[PDB]
Amino acid sequence: YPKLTGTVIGTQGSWNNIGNTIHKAFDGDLNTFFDGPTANGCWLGLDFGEGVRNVITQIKFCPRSGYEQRMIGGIFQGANKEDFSDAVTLFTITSLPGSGTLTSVDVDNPTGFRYVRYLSPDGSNGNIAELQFFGTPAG
Ligand SMILES: OC[C@H]1O[C@H](OC[C@H]2O[C@@H](O)[C@@H](O)[C@@H](O)[C@@H]2O)[C@H](O)[C@@H](O)[C@H]1O
Ligand SMILES: [Ca+2]
User: How far is the CA of 74 from the centre of ligand 2 (A)?
Assistant: First the structure.
């Protein structure tokens, strides 16, 4: 299934205002990463757009090099409300992701979502180098 496109959404700003914003997780470079402005609460994802819903069949991600531990416990969610109050967890990261590569995980949830995100665990500053969603328009 193809890589899904959308509008990047999530935590605004970056650590020490250096500029490593959420957009660095979608730029195709595994060397660039999102470094959030706070230790906790950081998240990033996509809005596929009004009236657009995709079924998610796979997620790929790559940790920030040297900070792979900061992804453990992170979750990926799908939702149809931008505040994620109706979210369901699509996958939970429970082991250390390999450095410098995209780890691919299958998703088995038939629901169509307008919104998807990665919700980072405490102490991570949202650290992630790259994030990709795959799937198909909801029937
Ligand atoms: O705390 C978030 C922060 O963690 C690392 O930096 C930790 C500290 O490193 C030190 O060398 C000092 O620069 C100190 O100011 C830092 O808090 C990451 O390298 C950084 O990007 C950021 O994620
Ligand atoms: Ca990147």
Answer: 17
